Each structure stands twice: as C-alpha cells, then as structure tokens.
Symmetry: C4
Subunit: 327 residues, 4 copies
C-alpha cells in the first residue's frame, strides 16, 4: 500500500480477476517453471508414476489378450514378458523399462509381437516425458531471476549538489567477482498524477534519465558505483524542494538489467526508493581502498551515508538564483 | 484482407511461390521445431524405429557372415549376440541396446570381434540421434512464442487529449506475477501509400513514436499500463480528424517484445488495431485498486473504455487553433 | 578480391599468421562446435572409444592385482567382475557400464572392494564425457547461424527518388511464416579511404543510416519490405552521381540481425552489394497481392527491378538545384 | 594498484567484507558454475556418492524391517532385492539403479511392496540430481566468458590527427573465421575526480563516445578494425596535451560485447589502456593484404605502431588555433 515494489524486488501486486484461465494452460511449460519447488517436485513425481502404471496397465492387458495368465504355470506358453505374473510385477516392469534400467529378471520375449510395439511407444514416449521434465528441472535451476540476490542496492538514495548541478544518487554493487555482461541501469518514477482533463492515473510510470542519452546507462559493474541522475529541467524532481520531499507521495523504481555471465540469461534486479528513503543533503561513503596491488571494496560501508552541506531550494530555484548571480 | 495481423498475433500472410525449397532442408533443425506437434511427434517416432531396425539389420547380417544361424542348435558356435535367432529378436536387440535398456537375455559375447564395433557405432551414433531429437523436443516445449498467451492487449485503442496534447493510447497487461525482463514496446503503422513518383507501396510500415526517444519504450510490466503515443507533427496521425478516422484505411501493429523471466528467450507479442477499433474521445477505465496492503488489478475492466469530452479536430488544427489563442 | 563478403554471407578473409594458437585450445568448446561435421563426428567417435578402453584397461588391471586371471578356472576366486576373462571382454565391460547398458553377463561382484571405486569414477566421469559431447552435438544442431538460409536478400540494390529525396533501397524477406523477433537492419559501407595525414585505411567501415535514429532500423519482417536509406548530407553517397557509380570502388555490407523465434539465439544474415550491383533509376517490383482474405507474397518477383525515370545528378546537386528553384 | 583491470580482462578488485553470505547460497546454481574446475569436479563427485550410499542405506534398512538378513540362507524368504546381503552389496545396488545400469545379479523382487516405492524415489529424485549436475557441467563448458580468449585487443592505444580531428584509436580483432553477432564496442574512462563540493570519487567511470550516437558502436568484426574516438569537446581528453599525457593518472577500459555465433550467449571482452600505453603521434600498421581472391590478415603486425607527424597541442588548443586561421 505504502510501497509498490519491495526492497527485495518483489512487487505488491495481486493480479485480480483473471478470467481466461485457459491462457495459463495454453503455455503449460512457463506456468510450470514459475511454480514453487514443492509444486514442481510434486508434479515431477506425479507424472512419472502416472506414466509407469499407465504402461504397466498395458503390459498387464497384453497378458490377458495373450492368455499368459491363463497358462502361467504351463511353461510352453512363453509370455510376452517372461516372469510377469501380477500387477505388482507388471508395474515393476515399466519402471525397469521406461527408466531404461532393464534388469532382465522380467525380460520381454520375441514370441509375442504385440509388446514389441509396446517397447517402442513406451520408450519413444518416455523419452519426451523425461525431456518435458528433465528440462523443466534444469531451467528452474538455471534461471537468472536468482542472480539478483547477489546484486545489492543501496538502502537509501541521496541528493546532493554534485559539481554545481543538483543530482539524485543511489549506489548499486555486485557481490561477486563474476561480472554482469551488458549491465544496464534504468529508473522509473511512479506516482499518481491527474491530467488536465480529469483522467486520474493511479500509478503512472515516468522515466528518470540516469544516462540513457549519453550512453551512461550501460554501466561497468565490477565495483560499487554511484548512479547519478542529474536533476535538470526534464527531470521529475525539477520543482521538488526540501520542503516537499517529506510530503511527496512518489516512489523511485530502479531496474538493473544485465545478462548473467556464465549463461546467456538476463537477470533483472529491481529495487525501490520511497519518499522516506530519499535523503537531502547526504552523500555516500567511499568503499574502495587500495591495498597490496588490489582495490579492496569494504561492503560494510556500502550503505553508509553522511550529511554534507547542501542548499535546500529546488533545482528550479537553484538555476534561477544562479541566473541572478550573473544578473 | 481487411486485417494484416490478427488480434491473436497471427499474420494473414501466405508465403507464395518459394522456389528454393532446399533452403528449408538446409537448416533442418529450425524447420523441424516450427512444425505442428503431430508432425513433431510423428517424425520423432519415425526416426527411432528407422534407427533400431537399421542396426537390427546389421545385427542380423553379422549372424550370416559368422554363420551363427547356420549352427544355431550347435552350441559350440557361440554367436556374436547369444540367443539372437530371428529378425524379431535381432530388431529387439537394438532397442535393448540403443536405448541402453540391455536386458541380457540376448547378450553380446566376446568371441565375435565384428559386433564389438557394432556396439560402438550403435551407441556412439544413437546418442546423437537421441540428442538431435531429445533437444528438439525440449526447445519446442521451452519456446518463448507461447509466453505471449499471457500477455494481453486492449481490444481497442483510444484517442483523447492527455494533458493538452492529443494522444493515441492502448493498454497492455501481463497476466502473471512473473515478469517480462527487458520489456520493450514498439508500434508500426502499416498503410498503403503512393509516392510522388508513382511507386505505390502496398503495405508500407511506418513507425509510431511510443517513446523510443526518451526511453519510454522500455516499460515496466507488473501492472497494466497505458502506452501513450503523443500525436505530434512527426506522427502519422498528424492530420487525421474525427471525420477521417472512420474513413481511413490504416492499421496499427503493436509489438511487445521482452525476454521471458524464467529463461533467456525473448517473447514477441503482436497485436493490431484497425481503423474500426480506434476510438475517438474515449479513455480507459482504471483497474488498480488498493486493498489490504496490495494493489489489486481487476482484469475484468482491462478493456473497458468510456467516452469523455474531446475536440474533434486533428492535431494539426488543434495546435494552430492554440496558436490563434495567443494571437 | 573484388568482393569482401559473398552474396551468401561468407567473408573473403583469411586470418593469416595467428601465433597464439593456445588461445584456440584455451576455449576448447567453441573451437569444437565451429568445426565441420565430419570433424565433429570424428572427435565425438574418438572420445568415447578412448574413454571406454581407458577404463577397460583399469578393469583389466584390477584383475591382475587381484589375480582373478591367475585363478580363472578356479571358481572359489570370485572376480571383481565375474565372467571378465580377456581384454576383449574387459573392454566390452566398459561400454556396457559407461553407456549404462549393463547386460549382466559380466556383472561386478561385491567381494572386491577396488572396482567399486571404479564404478564411481567411470560413471561419475562418463557422465561429463557424455555432457561435454551430447551438449556439443546439440548446440551445433541448434545454432542460429543456419537460420540465415531462410532470410533472403535482394540480389541488387536500387536508387530512385522516393518522395522528392533520392534514396538507396534494397529488399529483404523472410521465407518462413515463423518470425524473426527483434529484427534489426544495419548497413556498413566499406571502402578504401585516405586521410589528410597520409594514413591510408584499406577497408574502412562507414555507417549507412538505414533508420537508426527514428527507430526504423528495428523492422517487422513478416512480408518482404524495402529497406530505404535516404541519401542525405551525412550519407556517404552524398556526392555520388550516376557518372561515378560505375567507376566507384565501394561495397555495401548489410547485416540483418534478429533473434530466432523458436529459441533465444540471435541469427546474423549478411549480404553485400558492390558497385556493379547498385542500380540507378530502378525500383523494385511489388510482391504482395491480396487473394481470399490473405496477402500472398509472390517470391518469384522478389528480385525483379524495373527502370523508372530518375535524374542522373547526385543528391548534392539535386538539393542545390532545388535551392535554385525557390531562387 | 597501478592498474584497475588487467590486459587479459581480469579485474584487480577484491570484494571485501561481504556479510550476507546467505546470498551466495540463495542462488546455489550460479555460485557453483563460477567455481574452479577442481571444485566443480569435486562437488560433482561428492554429490553422486552421497546420493548412492544415502539410498543404499535405505536399501539396507528395508532388509532389516523385512528380516531378509534374518533369513538370508533360508530361501523361502524372498528378499526385496534378491542377492542383496551386505552393505557393500546394498551400496552397489544403488549405483546399478540410480545410474540405470541395472545388471540384475541383484534384482528387486515383487514380493516386497516397500522397495517398490524406493525404486520411484530413487529414480524420480536421481534424475534431478543428474539434471542439477549434468546441466551444471554443460553451462560451465558452454560459457561465453571463454570466447574472449580469441578476441584480441591492441596492446597500445594511439592518438593521431585522423582527417583534421585529433582522434584516440585502438585496434580490436577476432582470431576466428566465426563471427561475433551483434558486436558492440564501448569505452569507459575511469579516473579519480574531485567535485566542487569536496566529494572525492576514487574511480569514477566516464564514457568515451566511440560512436554510440551515429551507430558506429555496433561494429562488424570479420577483420581487425581501428576503433576511433574523436577527441571533441564532450570528450574527456579535450584538454589533454602531450605534456600531460605522461603525467596523467587515467585509465581507459574498453568493453567489446557481442553474442557468440554458435550459441546465443553474449561474450564480454575487457581490456584496458593506462596512461603509459597511450601513444601520441603514433598510428597503426595496416594488416590486410590482398592475395589470390582473399584478403589475408597478417596478425603479426596487429600491434605494430609507427610514429607519424602530429601536433603536440591539445584538441582544445587545436580547434582555437584553427579558429585563428580563419581569423
Ligand atoms: C510450503 C509449500 O507448499 O511450498 C514449499 C516451498 C516450495 O518451493 P519454495 O517455496 O522453497 O521455492 C522458492 C519459493 O517459492 C520462493 O518464495 C520463490 O521466491 P523467493 O524465494 O521468495 O525469492 C523462489 O522462486 P523460484 O525458485 O520458485 O522461481 C522459489 O524457488 O518450499 C519448498 O518446498 C522448498 C524448496 C525445495
Ligand atoms: C491435426 C494435425 O495434423 O496436427 C494436429 C496439431 C499438431 O499440434 P499443433 O501445432 O496444432 O499444436 C499447437 C497449436 O496448433 C497452436 O495453435 C500452435 O500455435 P498457434 O496457436 O497456431 O499460434 C502451436 O505452435 P507451436 O507454438 O507449438 O509451434 C502448435 O504447436 O495439433 C495437435 O495435434 C495438438 C498438439 C498435440
Ligand atoms: C569433407 C570433410 O572432411 O568434411 C565434410 C564436411 C564436414 O561437415 P560440414 O560442417 O562441412 O557440413 C556442412 C557442409 O559442409 C555445408 O556445406 C556447410 O555450409 P556453409 O557453407 O558453412 O553454410 C555447413 O556449415 P557449418 O555447419 O560448418 O556451419 C557444414 O556444417 O561436410 C560433411 O561431411 C557434411 C556434414 C555431415
Ligand atoms: C588448483 C585448484 O584447486 O584448482 C585447479 C583449477 C580448477 O580449474 P580452473 O578454474 O583453474 O580452470 C580454469 C582456469 O583457472 C582459468 O584461468 C579460469 O579463468 P581465468 O583464466 O581465471 O579468467 C577458468 O574459469 P572458468 O571460465 O572455467 O569458470 C577456470 O575454470 O585448475 C584446474 O584444475 C584446471 C581445470 C581442470
Ligand atoms: K541387465
Ligand atoms: K540397463
Ligand atoms: K540401462
């Protein structure tokens, strides 16, 4: 309510009264991988057992059409699967075959032509039942959405006059010595707005130019670096003074997107900054020290902000007051 | 005819008299995965059976060169595969070996040196026959082109003066609590045009600036958000009044591209808006309500449009009439 | 010599005296997949056989340390692998185990503790020998570089005054009803140039603005569409008249990049246009006809160019002669 | 210390006092693949053996609940797994089953219902233990981060007046006849800076416009080509004369990003240039010669730089001195 997207990156959105629920089953794969693990591990368990006893019913039924059960002690009646006698054995024959274990205490014989077809359609279909599930287990393990746990954001965002221009800043860092190839940063300001025609938008997304023009959005992320957005005329913080910033009802949403290095999958690290986390007159503490040929990044001071001197007027007043300085 | 691309996303295009049909077989993998499932499941079935009886013919023929069939009852003649007697058994030996089931009622012996080579070339080639097909079954299951079923578009597009500027708008929403990383929106206007030199183009694609300059095309898609294109001078709707919009022969094509979250594959969600679906003087109904800490998105009102007051002149007249207001 | 990159897309470049040949073996995977298939199929064959007889030597040597061969007829000496007697049988035991066939005519026994370790290190290492090779066979099959065989280019490029501005044009089409998601077009002019300081560059790449500014480079590729580059002042064809175009020594290189739809891999379709393939005063024939609700694309007329009336002056003269028209 | 990122591409950064070490285990897959191979091969070995003897304990314990050990010589007591007698045999039964070898000297029987469940939960869980590890071995083999070994950079960067404008240049080349699809080049200048407000940034990243505006950053990389950055007013080398360039404390970081051709993974090739590797008045030697229809690229002269005549003033003086030439 207070917050749109959590500081973890989770979003406070319930997707209400979706009516076309066939659309979830229209792409059964992607709605399967985004399940919980317990539900993934249960449906993985459920599909193999329902596969084996399905074929185990067919390995049972070919004994009844052939009458191998009707002459079980009669040894001249060579069965389709020898030593298959009961359903506990018939179901056991499928697991030995669909998993390609194949013990051969029960071994299919050649006198029966019917189950030879059943060796095909168990094995040619059991491979895709494997592949629909062994691939589903892989891409839930190798998903990029968990790489964001090692991409940390600053807990607060700060505002200070960086080189004459008032700038909004927040720190982002990577906790690994592996890289984020094609690392891009972008930022959306979301706030309720009301147009001149009465059309009130509840959570309107508005861009924040964190360097999309000059090429500064694509960033190099070995060390924690401060993402500075210059509060200029096009910025949505252009008329925000230090009087309004406790009273505003806005929310920054930052999205650090970039490909995982060891794969080609693209991670997305979301974080947010609400108007009680925006700090006026503060700046970040440095983290890089030089020691024995290497720059050491103390991550304990990653969030540490200290108060510096800063004017309290908005950037709209600060430019015009600078315009009176030349007179 | 009336429509270029369907509201589902399918395109009303037949690809006519393609002559270089070897180009389809020049990349046999990608022309295989885009088949129907019945044709994928049939060619998967067809290739394993034609593999096993191919090797089963070679497991047959090594009995004839060795004369194991010529001394089948003679027990001193240890065969290359013992208990291999007929082609129904020889074909059965391949399925037990190429699938690596290996029952061992028929078990290859060491007295024969010829079939030892045949164990290699069945297993070293049966693995890639597996891999050319078990991978083909995977990427047809894990394809991003089915993720677009959960990316819904508004059924209509609307036009209304959003904050003094006339703007064309359409809603897009995501039906899941999973995200679309790197979600981009772009829009093409396609219409027949005739140049000054008589060169008439049948379906000429023309861009619609939905925010490609400012960075507004890359969008954050947890909640349904309105994609607004400002009707400015560079826009192709610049001289379109409400008199012409029933009479036009144009068609919007919107493309929402973005990577699937759980994989790295990029989905493409197409939709279209023809000149009977463009609404003048209408605007969307809001969908986000706040309830118990979470924003709940009622998707029943996702398409709901209501009529608001709007001038009926074009944006070319609306700017110049505004230019007469300052006089 | 005449041509830099072929009309297929192959490049006429030999990579000379590369000295650091360890860099090829420093990434052994990617230098393996780009081999020919015969060399891929040979190294796949070579690695499994050298794996099995490697372990078959170890399955041999454990018989000598245990002396199972020294008491082969003596039945109280239960071997580590029973019925393992010779190297033809010992090598055969590895294929039955590393492929997980496991017939069980030769079956490992529990009296020996040494080969129990050998079951691990054969199976725990034979799985990655599989995975280093079954994955290598997959990504050579699923590579995007073969998707360019169904992306056709026009054989010629044309130049004609499209709507008052002289424009260079070439057609590109997709031969399938599957799409190219995120389809982008870009074009490089390569020609020898000599700077003012005598530094002569042999094949200097120079951009061609095919719509990179306005968003026209990202194209929608269901139907064959003409890629127009407007010959403006920044264009490298700005002072090229029809007198110079037979005499020039330039070469267009067009690159159509876009992701394959059924996967996430990005294809790259290269083609070229040399100064004998650039046509002045020509324009393309249309290909789209409307028939029974669908637009049918006759691909026979994909390359068909016809001569239209066009001024023969350059775009530098055509603007200035237009500048004299207003006088 | 002297250097931020090595000429190989490695970065001289230690990631200090990371406290939230659960974040590494929160995404156990990606922190596994970035390990060393010895640690990957050990954890792969450790997980299969701890899996098999885990189930081998359960295959042991079902003999004690059933009392198969209590009637081992008594043949009427058909065990759950026949010929399972000791823990050396019970552990051996798991490897024959979890790997799906299945010799059948020990073969599970149907009289026991308990171990039938144990066939499921060994096989339905041993497949994902395979898949969590056979996929981990694949993506460590198929990673794009090793493709950068065949992407070479020039060892030095040079500065010379290319066509009236002073330009900073460095060569990049690809050692293979395979391509880098979507090859982009970007460059960051990193140097310590001190703002007007005393906020001293230790290693501030600053862009270098290598052609991000005109579309020149996306480059075509069949032949070694010189990446030229024009020293203009927005460039950070704008006031750098030849007097300051030995005395500066800056460092170029170049990043050549592009997708691997045979896969869809994106490589990232980093290199660096420190102020002792920047050459004033030097230019590269050409490498392309034409021979027998093909351009041959002598890679021995890839790094070769020769001294040319160049003014020693900065680009700020060179423009203004040119401004005095028109007077
Ligand atoms: C209770 C019940 O019914 O479900 C149990 C639940 C199911 O799986 P489990 O919840 O652990 O799986 C994770 C969990 O669902 C998290 O909430 C997800 O996001 P996050 O963690 O919040 O970031 C995370 O994303 P993804 O991995 O699903 O994409 C999941 O992996 O947990 C287990 O069974 C242990 C996993 C074995
Ligand atoms: C009749 C006959 O000969 O073929 C039957 C046909 C084959 O499978 P089929 O292709 O219809 O199954 C999917 C279905 O057709 C979708 O409609 C396709 O996408 P779209 O909606 O067209 O865009 C989807 O394409 P893809 O995304 O899967 O490639 C299809 O796979 O349908 C079945 O048997 C159901 C699957 C078993
Ligand atoms: C003779 C000898 O020693 O090797 C023969 C060679 C090896 O396989 P090879 O790779 O050449 O097989 C394909 C064949 O060479 C095509 O002509 C190539 O087309 P392109 O021009 O690259 O488009 C294709 O490109 P790519 O797959 O290499 O990319 C090749 O893969 O061809 C075969 O044996 C057919 C495959 C079995
Ligand atoms: C000693 C000890 O405990 O570990 C031994 C170490 C483990 O493998 P190790 O990591 O050294 O093998 C690769 C090598 O170290 C490279 O130098 C690494 O990249 P870079 O050059 O550092 O950039 C590469 O990273 P990745 O790209 O493979 O992840 C490594 O995998 O080396 C071996 O055993 C050879 C492989 C068997
Ligand atoms: K067996
Ligand atoms: K087996
Ligand atoms: K097996």
């Amino acid at each position: 309510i207070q917050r749109y997207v959590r500081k973890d990156g989770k979003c406070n959105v319930h997707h209400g009264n979706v009516r076309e629920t066939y659309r979830y089953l229209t792409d059964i794969f992607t709605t399967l991988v985004d399940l919980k693990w317990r539900f993934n591990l249960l449906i993985f368990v459920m599909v193999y057992t329902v596969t084996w006893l399905f074929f185990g019913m067919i390995w049972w039924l070919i004994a009844y059409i052939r009458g191998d059960m009707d002459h079980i002690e009669d040894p001249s009646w060579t069965p389709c699967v020898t030593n298959l006698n009961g359903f506990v054995s018939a179901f056991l024959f499928s697991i030995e075959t669909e998993t390609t274990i194949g013990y051969g205490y029960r071994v299919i014989t050649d006198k029966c032509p019917e189950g030879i077809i059943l060796l095909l359609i168990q094995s040619v279909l059991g491979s895709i039942v494997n592949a629909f599930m062994v691939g589903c287990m892989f891409v839930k393990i190798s998903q990029p959405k968990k790489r964001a746990e090692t991409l940390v954001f600053s807990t607060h965002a700060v505002i200070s006059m960086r080189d004459g221009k008032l700038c909004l800043m927040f720190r982002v860092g990577d906790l690994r010595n592996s890289h984020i190839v094609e690392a891009s940063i972008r930022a959306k300001l979301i706030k309720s707005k009301q147009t001149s025609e009465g059309e009130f938008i509840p959570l309107n997304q508005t861009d924040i130019n964190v360097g999309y023009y000059t090429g500064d959005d694509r960033l190099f992320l070995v060390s924690p670096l401060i993402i500075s957005h210059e509060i200029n005329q096009q910025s949505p913080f252009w008329e925000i003074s230090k009087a309004q910033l406790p009273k505003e009802e806005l929310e920054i949403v930052v999205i650090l997107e970039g490909m995982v290095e060891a794969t080609g999958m693209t991670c997305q690290a979301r974080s947010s900054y609400i108007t009680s986390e925006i700090l006026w007159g503060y700046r970040f503490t440095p983290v890089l020290t030089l020691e024995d040929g290497f720059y050491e990044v103390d991550y304990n001071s990653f969030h540490e902000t200290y108060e510096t001197s800063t004017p309290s007027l908005s950037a709209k007043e600060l430019a015009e007051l600078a315009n009176r300085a030349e007179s």
